[PDB]
Backbone as numpy.savetxt, mean C-alpha at the origin, in Angstrom:
# Nx Ny Nz CAx CAy CAz Cx Cy Cz
15.83 -12.84 22.32 16.72 -13.29 21.22 16.11 -12.82 19.89
15.14 -13.57 19.34 14.84 -13.59 17.91 14.61 -12.17 17.39
14.04 -11.32 18.24 13.57 -10.01 17.83 14.73 -9.02 17.70
15.76 -9.22 18.55 16.91 -8.33 18.58 17.85 -8.69 17.44
17.98 -10.00 17.19 18.74 -10.45 16.04 18.14 -9.85 14.76
16.81 -9.86 14.66 16.18 -9.39 13.44 16.48 -7.91 13.26
16.50 -7.17 14.38 16.85 -5.76 14.37 18.27 -5.56 13.85
19.22 -6.32 14.41 20.62 -6.22 14.00 20.74 -6.46 12.49
19.89 -7.35 11.96 19.93 -7.69 10.55 19.42 -6.55 9.68
18.28 -5.95 10.05 17.75 -4.84 9.26 18.71 -3.64 9.33
19.26 -3.35 10.52 20.18 -2.23 10.71 21.34 -2.33 9.72
21.95 -3.51 9.67 23.07 -3.73 8.77 22.60 -3.54 7.32
21.39 -4.00 7.02 20.88 -3.91 5.66 20.70 -2.44 5.26
20.19 -1.61 6.17 19.96 -0.22 5.80 21.30 0.49 5.61
22.32 0.03 6.36 23.65 0.60 6.29 24.34 0.18 4.99
24.18 -1.10 4.62 24.66 -1.65 3.36 24.30 -0.76 2.17
23.07 -0.24 2.12 22.64 0.49 0.94 22.51 1.98 1.27
22.99 2.39 2.45 23.06 3.80 2.83 21.66 4.42 2.82
20.76 3.88 3.63 19.44 4.47 3.77 18.74 3.97 5.03
17.43 3.81 4.94 16.61 3.63 6.12 15.50 2.62 5.81
15.36 1.60 6.66 14.31 0.61 6.47 13.34 0.59 7.65
12.05 0.66 7.33 10.99 0.51 8.31 10.14 -0.74 8.06
9.93 -1.50 9.13 9.27 -2.79 9.05 8.23 -2.93 10.16
7.13 -3.65 9.84 6.18 -4.15 10.82 5.50 -5.40 10.26
5.54 -6.48 11.05 4.98 -7.76 10.66 4.11 -8.30 11.78
3.01 -8.97 11.41 2.06 -9.54 12.36 1.75 -10.97 11.92
1.81 -11.93 12.85 1.24 -13.24 12.60 -0.16 -13.27 13.22
-1.22 -13.34 12.41 -2.57 -13.15 12.93 -3.03 -14.40 13.67
-2.28 -15.49 13.46 -2.51 -16.76 14.12 -2.07 -16.75 15.58
-0.94 -16.11 15.87 -0.38 -16.08 17.22 -0.45 -14.69 17.85
-0.60 -13.64 17.04 -0.54 -12.28 17.56 0.87 -11.70 17.62
1.88 -12.55 17.35 3.30 -12.17 17.37 3.57 -11.07 16.35
4.31 -10.04 16.78 4.66 -8.90 15.94 6.17 -8.68 15.95
6.65 -7.97 14.92 8.03 -7.52 14.84 8.05 -6.14 14.20
8.84 -5.25 14.80 8.90 -3.86 14.37 10.32 -3.33 14.37
10.64 -2.57 13.32 11.92 -1.90 13.21 11.65 -0.54 12.60
11.89 0.50 13.41 11.61 1.89 13.04 10.12 2.03 12.75
9.33 1.12 13.33 7.92 0.94 12.98 7.06 2.17 13.31
7.58 3.10 14.14 6.84 4.32 14.44 7.43 5.53 13.74
8.43 5.33 12.89 8.98 6.46 12.15 8.22 6.61 10.84
8.30 7.82 10.28 7.54 8.24 9.11 8.28 7.91 7.82
7.55 7.38 6.83 8.11 7.14 5.49 7.12 7.66 4.45
7.61 8.14 3.27 6.72 8.52 2.17 5.82 7.36 1.74
4.56 7.67 1.43 3.58 6.67 1.03 3.77 6.27 -0.42
4.13 7.22 -1.28 4.07 6.99 -2.73 2.71 6.42 -3.10
2.69 5.49 -4.06 1.44 4.97 -4.59 0.77 3.98 -3.64
1.43 3.63 -2.53 0.92 2.55 -1.70 -0.44 2.95 -1.12
-0.70 4.25 -1.04 -1.96 4.71 -0.49 -3.11 4.23 -1.36
-2.82 3.90 -2.63 -3.88 3.58 -3.57 -4.63 2.31 -3.16
-3.98 1.48 -2.34 -4.64 0.30 -1.82 -5.68 0.64 -0.76
-5.46 1.77 -0.06 -6.43 2.23 0.91 -7.55 2.97 0.20
-7.22 3.68 -0.87 -8.19 4.42 -1.64 -9.22 3.45 -2.22
-8.77 2.24 -2.57 -9.65 1.23 -3.13 -10.62 0.73 -2.05
-10.13 0.74 -0.81 -10.94 0.28 0.31 -11.96 1.35 0.67
-11.55 2.62 0.60 -12.47 3.72 0.88 -13.61 3.69 -0.12
-13.32 3.36 -1.38 -14.35 3.19 -2.39 -15.29 2.06 -1.99
-14.75 0.87 -1.68 -15.58 -0.26 -1.30 -16.44 0.03 -0.06
-15.95 0.89 0.84 -16.73 1.24 2.01 -17.93 2.10 1.61
-17.72 3.04 0.69 -18.80 3.84 0.15 -19.85 2.96 -0.53
-19.41 1.92 -1.25 -20.32 1.01 -1.93 -21.23 0.33 -0.90
-20.60 -0.12 0.19 -21.23 -0.93 1.22 -22.25 -0.07 1.97
-21.94 1.22 2.15 -22.84 2.17 2.80 -23.93 2.65 1.85
-23.86 2.20 0.59 -24.89 2.48 -0.42 -24.84 3.93 -0.91
-23.71 4.61 -0.68 -23.48 5.95 -1.21 -23.00 5.91 -2.66
-22.57 4.73 -3.13 -22.06 4.49 -4.47 -22.41 3.07 -4.91
-22.49 2.86 -6.21 -22.76 1.55 -6.80 -21.48 1.12 -7.51
-21.04 -0.12 -7.24 -19.80 -0.67 -7.79 -19.83 -0.72 -9.33
-21.03 -0.75 -9.92 -21.15 -0.84 -11.37 -21.43 0.50 -12.05
-21.46 1.62 -11.31 -21.86 2.86 -11.97 -20.79 3.30 -12.98
-21.23 3.81 -14.14 -20.33 4.30 -15.18 -19.73 5.64 -14.72
-18.41 5.75 -14.79 -17.70 7.00 -14.53 -17.12 7.46 -15.87
-17.70 8.53 -16.42 -17.27 9.10 -17.69 -16.20 10.17 -17.42
-15.20 10.28 -18.31 -14.08 11.21 -18.19 -13.51 11.51 -19.58
-14.43 11.57 -20.55 -14.17 11.74 -21.97 -13.30 12.96 -22.25
-13.40 14.02 -21.41 -12.80 15.31 -21.71 -11.49 15.54 -20.95
-11.13 14.59 -20.08 -10.10 14.82 -19.08 -8.69 14.68 -19.68
-7.77 15.53 -19.20 -6.35 15.40 -19.45 -5.71 14.53 -18.37
-5.46 13.25 -18.70 -5.04 12.21 -17.78 -3.58 12.39 -17.38
-3.30 12.03 -16.13 -1.98 12.16 -15.56 -1.03 11.15 -16.20
0.27 11.43 -16.07 1.27 10.42 -16.32 0.89 9.13 -15.59
1.19 8.01 -16.26 1.00 6.65 -15.77 -0.48 6.40 -15.48
-1.26 6.41 -16.55 -2.66 6.04 -16.49 -2.92 4.92 -17.49
-2.26 3.75 -17.36 -2.27 2.75 -18.43 -3.70 2.32 -18.73
-4.52 2.24 -17.67 -5.84 1.62 -17.75 -6.90 2.66 -18.10
-6.84 3.81 -17.42 -7.82 4.83 -17.70 -7.69 5.34 -19.14
-6.46 5.35 -19.67 -6.32 5.92 -21.00 -6.98 5.00 -22.05
-7.02 3.69 -21.80 -7.58 2.80 -22.81 -9.11 2.82 -22.79
-9.74 3.29 -21.70 -11.20 3.31 -21.61 -11.75 4.73 -21.68
-10.91 5.71 -22.00 -11.28 7.12 -21.97 -12.57 7.38 -22.76
-12.70 6.71 -23.91 -13.79 6.95 -24.84 -15.14 6.45 -24.31
-15.12 5.44 -23.43 -16.34 4.73 -23.09 -16.66 4.81 -21.60
-15.68 5.24 -20.78 -15.82 5.23 -19.32 -15.40 3.89 -18.71
-15.52 3.78 -17.38 -15.26 2.55 -16.65 -16.26 2.46 -15.50
-16.56 1.24 -15.03 -17.30 1.12 -13.78 -16.44 1.66 -12.65
-17.09 2.06 -11.56 -16.40 2.49 -10.36 -15.48 1.38 -9.85
-15.96 0.13 -9.90 -15.19 -1.00 -9.41 -13.92 -1.22 -10.24
-14.08 -1.22 -11.57 -12.95 -1.43 -12.45 -11.95 -0.29 -12.28
-12.46 0.93 -12.10 -11.58 2.07 -11.94 -10.83 1.94 -10.62
-11.54 1.57 -9.54 -10.92 1.52 -8.22 -9.80 0.48 -8.20
-10.05 -0.68 -8.86 -9.07 -1.76 -8.91 -7.90 -1.43 -9.84
-8.16 -0.64 -10.87 -7.08 -0.15 -11.71 -6.15 0.74 -10.88
-6.74 1.56 -10.00 -5.89 2.39 -9.17 -4.97 1.48 -8.35
-5.47 0.29 -8.01 -4.72 -0.54 -7.09 -3.70 -1.37 -7.87
-4.22 -2.12 -8.85 -3.47 -3.20 -9.45 -2.43 -2.67 -10.43
-2.69 -1.48 -10.98 -1.81 -0.91 -11.98 -1.28 0.43 -11.52
-1.67 0.85 -10.31 -1.27 2.12 -9.74 -1.63 3.31 -10.64
-2.77 3.23 -11.35 -3.20 4.18 -12.37 -3.53 5.54 -11.76
-2.86 6.60 -12.24 -2.97 7.91 -11.59 -4.27 8.62 -11.99
-4.73 8.37 -13.22 -6.01 8.92 -13.65 -7.14 8.37 -12.79
-7.15 7.04 -12.60 -8.13 6.37 -11.76 -8.12 7.06 -10.41
-6.91 7.25 -9.88 -6.68 7.75 -8.54 -7.18 9.19 -8.40
-6.77 10.06 -9.31 -7.14 11.45 -9.13 -8.64 11.64 -9.31
-9.23 10.88 -10.25 -10.65 10.98 -10.57 -11.48 10.58 -9.36
-11.11 9.44 -8.76 -11.82 8.92 -7.60 -11.79 9.93 -6.44
-10.60 10.50 -6.16 -10.46 11.44 -5.06 -11.24 12.74 -5.32
-11.35 13.15 -6.59 -12.01 14.42 -6.87 -13.53 14.32 -6.76
-14.11 13.14 -7.03 -15.54 13.01 -7.24 -16.19 12.25 -6.10
-15.49 11.29 -5.51 -16.12 10.35 -4.59 -15.55 10.47 -3.17
-14.32 10.96 -3.02 -13.64 10.69 -1.77 -13.26 11.98 -1.03
-13.54 13.15 -1.62 -13.27 14.42 -0.97 -11.78 14.76 -0.87
-11.01 14.39 -1.91 -9.61 14.74 -2.09 -8.70 14.06 -1.08
-7.45 14.54 -0.92 -6.53 14.07 0.11 -7.02 14.19 1.55
-7.79 15.25 1.84 -8.32 15.37 3.19 -9.40 14.32 3.42
-10.21 14.04 2.39 -11.20 12.98 2.46 -10.55 11.61 2.69
-9.45 11.35 1.98 -8.70 10.10 2.05 -8.11 9.92 3.45
-7.45 10.97 3.95 -6.98 11.03 5.32 -8.14 10.81 6.30
-9.30 11.46 6.07 -10.43 11.28 6.98 -10.87 9.81 7.00
-10.89 9.16 5.83 -11.25 7.75 5.76 -10.40 6.93 6.74
-9.09 7.20 6.76 -8.16 6.43 7.56 -8.35 6.71 9.06
-8.72 7.94 9.41 -8.99 8.27 10.80 -10.21 7.47 11.26
-11.18 7.30 10.36 -12.41 6.60 10.68 -12.15 5.12 10.98
-11.05 4.53 10.47 -10.79 3.16 10.88 -9.83 3.11 12.07
-9.49 4.28 12.65 -8.64 4.35 13.83 -7.14 4.48 13.52
-6.81 4.98 12.31 -5.42 5.20 11.95 -5.05 6.68 12.08
-4.21 6.99 13.07 -3.90 8.37 13.41 -2.63 8.89 12.73
-1.82 7.99 12.15 -0.50 8.37 11.65 -0.56 8.77 10.18
-1.39 8.06 9.41 -1.54 8.23 7.97 -1.93 9.67 7.65
-1.24 10.27 6.67 -1.66 11.56 6.16 -1.40 11.61 4.65
-2.42 12.03 3.91 -2.25 12.44 2.53 -2.52 13.94 2.42
-1.55 14.66 1.84 -1.62 16.10 1.77 -1.80 16.57 0.33
-1.28 15.80 -0.65 -1.17 16.22 -2.04 -1.80 15.19 -2.99
-1.98 15.57 -4.26 -2.53 14.68 -5.27 -1.38 13.99 -5.99
-1.69 12.92 -6.74 -0.76 12.40 -7.73 -0.54 13.54 -8.73
0.71 13.84 -9.11 1.88 13.05 -8.81 2.79 13.81 -7.85
2.34 14.96 -7.35 3.19 15.81 -6.53 3.55 15.12 -5.20
2.77 14.11 -4.79 2.94 13.49 -3.48 4.15 12.55 -3.49
4.90 12.59 -4.60 5.98 11.65 -4.86 7.35 12.28 -4.63
7.40 13.52 -4.14 8.68 14.20 -4.10 9.66 13.52 -3.14
9.17 12.84 -2.09 9.96 12.04 -1.15 11.15 12.82 -0.56
10.95 14.13 -0.35 11.97 15.05 0.12 12.36 14.67 1.55
13.67 14.43 1.85 14.07 14.10 3.22 13.57 15.22 4.14
12.89 14.82 5.22 12.47 15.73 6.28 11.00 16.13 6.16
10.36 15.81 5.03 9.00 16.26 4.75 8.02 15.24 5.32
7.01 15.70 6.07 6.06 14.77 6.68 4.83 14.59 5.78
4.71 15.42 4.74 3.56 15.29 3.86 3.55 13.89 3.27
2.36 13.30 3.15 2.19 12.08 2.37 3.04 10.96 2.96
2.89 10.74 4.27 3.66 9.75 5.00 2.73 9.02 5.95
3.27 7.91 6.47 2.68 7.11 7.52 3.83 6.36 8.19
3.48 5.42 9.08 4.48 4.60 9.73 4.22 3.16 9.29
5.27 2.31 9.29 5.09 0.89 8.96 4.00 0.20 9.79
4.01 0.45 11.10 3.05 -0.10 12.04 1.65 0.32 11.62
1.48 1.64 11.43 0.19 2.23 11.11 -0.38 1.60 9.84
0.50 1.35 8.87 0.08 0.78 7.61 -0.33 -0.69 7.83
0.51 -1.48 8.51 0.18 -2.86 8.82 -1.15 -2.93 9.57
-1.31 -2.12 10.63 -2.52 -2.21 11.41 -3.72 -1.97 10.50
-3.62 -0.93 9.67 -4.73 -0.56 8.80 -5.09 -1.69 7.83
-4.07 -2.23 7.15 -4.26 -3.26 6.14 -4.93 -4.47 6.79
-4.49 -4.78 8.02 -5.13 -5.83 8.80 -6.61 -5.49 8.97
-6.90 -4.27 9.42 -8.29 -3.90 9.68 -9.11 -4.09 8.40
-8.57 -3.63 7.26 -9.30 -3.57 6.01 -9.38 -4.93 5.32
-8.30 -5.71 5.37 -8.23 -6.94 4.59 -8.74 -8.14 5.40
-8.53 -8.13 6.72 -8.78 -9.31 7.54 -9.83 -9.05 8.61
-10.14 -7.78 8.84 -11.03 -7.38 9.91 -12.41 -7.04 9.37
-13.03 -6.03 9.97 -14.47 -5.93 10.05 -14.96 -4.60 9.48
-14.10 -3.91 8.74 -14.51 -2.62 8.20 -15.45 -2.90 7.03
-15.12 -3.96 6.28 -15.91 -4.37 5.14 -16.61 -5.68 5.51
-17.84 -5.86 5.00 -18.61 -7.06 5.28 -18.05 -8.19 4.43
-18.46 -9.42 4.77 -17.86 -10.63 4.23 -17.71 -10.53 2.71
-18.73 -9.96 2.04 -18.81 -9.95 0.58 -17.86 -8.91 -0.03
-17.89 -7.69 0.53 -17.10 -6.58 0.02 -15.63 -6.80 0.37
-15.39 -7.46 1.51 -14.04 -7.75 1.96 -13.36 -8.71 0.99
-14.10 -9.70 0.50 -13.62 -10.70 -0.46 -13.23 -10.04 -1.78
-14.04 -9.08 -2.23 -13.75 -8.32 -3.43 -12.40 -7.63 -3.26
-12.24 -6.94 -2.12 -11.05 -6.16 -1.80 -9.81 -7.05 -1.83
-9.91 -8.22 -1.18 -8.89 -9.26 -1.18 -8.52 -9.63 -2.62
-9.53 -9.86 -3.46 -9.26 -10.24 -4.84 -8.49 -9.14 -5.58
-8.92 -7.89 -5.39 -8.12 -6.78 -5.89 -6.66 -6.91 -5.43
-6.41 -7.05 -4.12 -5.05 -7.12 -3.61 -4.27 -8.28 -4.23
-4.90 -9.47 -4.29 -4.24 -10.64 -4.83 -3.91 -10.41 -6.31
-4.68 -9.52 -6.97 -4.51 -9.25 -8.39 -3.44 -8.19 -8.72
-2.80 -7.58 -7.70 -1.78 -6.56 -7.93 -0.67 -7.06 -8.88
-0.24 -6.19 -9.81 0.66 -6.58 -10.89 2.06 -6.03 -10.70
2.27 -5.15 -9.70 3.51 -4.40 -9.63 4.45 -4.92 -8.54
4.16 -6.10 -7.98 4.76 -6.44 -6.70 5.71 -7.65 -6.71
6.04 -8.18 -7.90 6.66 -9.50 -8.01 8.07 -9.56 -7.41
8.78 -8.42 -7.34 10.16 -8.39 -6.89 10.27 -7.94 -5.42
9.14 -7.81 -4.72 9.17 -7.31 -3.35 8.75 -8.43 -2.38
7.68 -8.21 -1.61 7.27 -9.17 -0.57 7.00 -10.54 -1.19
6.38 -10.56 -2.38 6.04 -11.82 -3.04 7.29 -12.65 -3.30
8.42 -11.96 -3.53 9.71 -12.58 -3.79 10.27 -13.23 -2.53
9.69 -12.91 -1.37 10.23 -13.31 -0.08 9.55 -14.57 0.49
8.58 -15.14 -0.23 7.79 -16.25 0.30 7.61 -17.29 -0.80
7.30 -18.58 -0.47 7.06 -19.60 -1.49 6.04 -19.14 -2.53
6.26 -19.55 -3.78 5.39 -19.25 -4.92 3.98 -19.81 -4.71
3.83 -20.84 -3.87 2.52 -21.47 -3.72 1.65 -20.75 -2.68
2.23 -19.94 -1.79 1.47 -19.08 -0.89 0.71 -18.01 -1.67
-0.46 -17.60 -1.15 -1.28 -16.58 -1.79 -0.97 -15.23 -1.13
-0.72 -14.22 -1.97 -0.27 -12.91 -1.53 -1.14 -11.86 -2.21
-1.53 -10.83 -1.45 -2.10 -9.60 -1.97 -1.24 -8.43 -1.50
-0.96 -7.47 -2.41 -0.06 -6.38 -2.05 -0.42 -5.10 -2.79
0.14 -3.99 -2.30 0.26 -2.74 -3.02 1.66 -2.21 -2.77
2.39 -1.98 -3.87 3.71 -1.35 -3.83 3.53 0.15 -4.00
4.64 0.87 -3.81 4.79 2.28 -4.11 6.26 2.60 -4.40
6.50 3.49 -5.37 7.84 3.90 -5.80 7.83 5.38 -6.17
8.47 6.21 -5.35 8.43 7.65 -5.55 9.26 8.06 -6.76
10.36 7.34 -7.04 11.25 7.67 -8.15 12.17 8.83 -7.79
12.34 9.03 -6.49 13.26 10.02 -5.96 13.73 9.47 -4.64
14.98 9.79 -4.28 15.54 9.49 -2.96 15.39 8.01 -2.62
15.48 7.17 -3.65 15.45 5.71 -3.55 14.29 5.22 -2.71
13.16 5.93 -2.75 12.04 5.69 -1.85 11.05 4.73 -2.50
10.78 3.61 -1.81 9.86 2.60 -2.33 9.35 1.75 -1.17
8.23 1.07 -1.37 7.63 0.36 -0.26 6.71 -0.73 -0.80
6.26 -1.60 0.10 5.28 -2.62 -0.21 4.57 -3.01 1.08
3.27 -3.30 0.97 2.54 -3.96 2.06 1.76 -5.15 1.50
1.54 -6.17 2.35 0.97 -7.43 1.90 0.18 -8.14 3.00
-0.88 -8.82 2.56 -1.48 -9.93 3.28 -1.00 -11.22 2.61
-0.50 -12.15 3.42 0.05 -13.41 2.97 -0.75 -14.52 3.65
-1.27 -15.45 2.84 -1.92 -16.66 3.30 -0.99 -17.85 3.07
-0.23 -18.33 4.09 0.62 -19.50 3.88 -0.32 -20.70 3.76
0.15 -21.77 3.12 -0.59 -23.01 3.09 -0.86 -23.46 4.53
-2.15 -23.62 4.85 -2.62 -24.24 6.08 -2.17 -23.47 7.33
-2.23 -22.13 7.29 -1.80 -21.28 8.39 -2.66 -20.01 8.34
-2.83 -19.32 9.48 -3.54 -18.05 9.48 -2.74 -17.01 8.71
-3.37 -15.92 8.19 -2.65 -14.90 7.41 -1.54 -14.16 8.15
-0.54 -13.65 7.40 0.47 -12.72 7.90 0.22 -11.34 7.30
0.73 -10.31 7.97 0.72 -8.95 7.46 2.16 -8.46 7.48
2.62 -7.94 6.34 3.96 -7.40 6.25 3.88 -5.99 5.66
4.73 -5.10 6.20 4.79 -3.70 5.86 6.25 -3.25 5.80
6.76 -2.99 4.58 8.13 -2.59 4.32 8.19 -1.22 3.63
8.90 -0.26 4.25 9.10 1.12 3.77 10.59 1.48 3.81
11.09 2.11 2.74 12.51 2.45 2.59 12.65 3.83 1.96
13.74 4.53 2.34 14.25 5.74 1.72 15.76 5.60 1.56
16.38 6.47 0.74 17.83 6.49 0.61 18.34 7.92 0.77
19.66 8.08 0.98 20.24 9.38 1.30 20.09 10.34 0.12
20.50 9.94 -1.09 20.65 10.90 -2.18 19.46 10.91 -3.14
19.17 12.11 -3.66 18.08 12.35 -4.59 18.14 11.36 -5.75
19.36 10.99 -6.15 19.52 10.25 -7.39 19.58 8.75 -7.14
19.58 8.35 -5.86 19.51 6.95 -5.51 18.26 6.34 -6.14
18.40 5.10 -6.64 17.30 4.29 -7.13 16.83 3.37 -6.01
15.55 3.02 -6.02 14.98 2.16 -4.99 15.63 0.79 -5.12
15.42 -0.07 -4.11 16.04 -1.38 -4.13 15.03 -2.48 -3.81
14.61 -3.21 -4.83 13.59 -4.25 -4.68 14.11 -5.35 -3.76
15.38 -5.73 -3.97 16.02 -6.83 -3.27 16.17 -6.52 -1.79
16.31 -5.24 -1.46 16.40 -4.85 -0.07 15.02 -5.05 0.57
13.97 -4.58 -0.13 12.60 -4.79 0.32 12.33 -6.28 0.51
12.72 -7.08 -0.49 12.52 -8.52 -0.43 13.23 -9.09 0.80
14.42 -8.58 1.11 15.24 -9.17 2.15 14.71 -8.73 3.51
14.31 -7.46 3.59 13.65 -6.97 4.79 12.42 -7.83 5.09
11.68 -8.21 4.05 10.50 -9.03 4.26 10.90 -10.42 4.75
11.94 -11.00 4.14 12.42 -12.32 4.50 12.70 -12.33 6.00
13.43 -11.32 6.48 13.87 -11.20 7.86 12.67 -11.06 8.80
11.72 -10.19 8.45 10.54 -9.90 9.25 9.67 -11.15 9.43
9.46 -11.89 8.34 8.62 -13.07 8.35 9.19 -14.08 9.35
10.51 -14.20 9.39 11.16 -15.09 10.34 11.02 -14.59 11.78
11.13 -13.27 12.00 11.12 -12.74 13.35 9.81 -13.10 14.07
8.70 -13.25 13.33 7.38 -13.45 13.93 6.95 -14.92 13.87
7.93 -15.81 13.70 7.69 -17.19 13.35 7.64 -18.04 14.63
């Protein structure tokens, strides 16, 4: 019953707005999962930046990097949408502050700088994900070219399942030690771009950490989250969407509703 009904609901929703919805949800308390198109590919957009922040924290933990080291970029021509890096250009930022800016504000300067100097580019980022056992995730391009969201293109994509599994590994599992994992969680809980998506789908009193992404083409947008309900084990939700036409705008309310439906399916 419950799982097929949830499918019928998402199907109608994707048809309502003439596009495609991918979902994967996990209740870590029971192990119960729900998936819809969960093995199909969707553009990552900025959502990868939440994994990039984890790859940084892993380097810190392995002692290859220090969370407080100054990263200077006084001479750099910063990408579009660098709200945070542009204000510290004159003085630099710590690696930690930069990594969290990439996450919480989706800062492209933070992102490109980190990948060029610490993470070995898109192939390095992809390699990081393989190291935690994620085979689907691929980053091929840098900000902002990875945003084209061209129908049929596999570059810069993953699957809802793959993303959920990974976020679980990174946020709730054992890739990061107790201390570094807590930092990562705080970064996620501090995300500023997510209020109309998964967070909109659950009580205001529940604690949520997320990373959104919005390509700004082909109505492509997404969100992933760890949710701590009051007095319950955490949930993991992963919502990815595309639309038919280049000029379609993304739909926050669809994401929110997909999340509403998924959370119930695993209940």
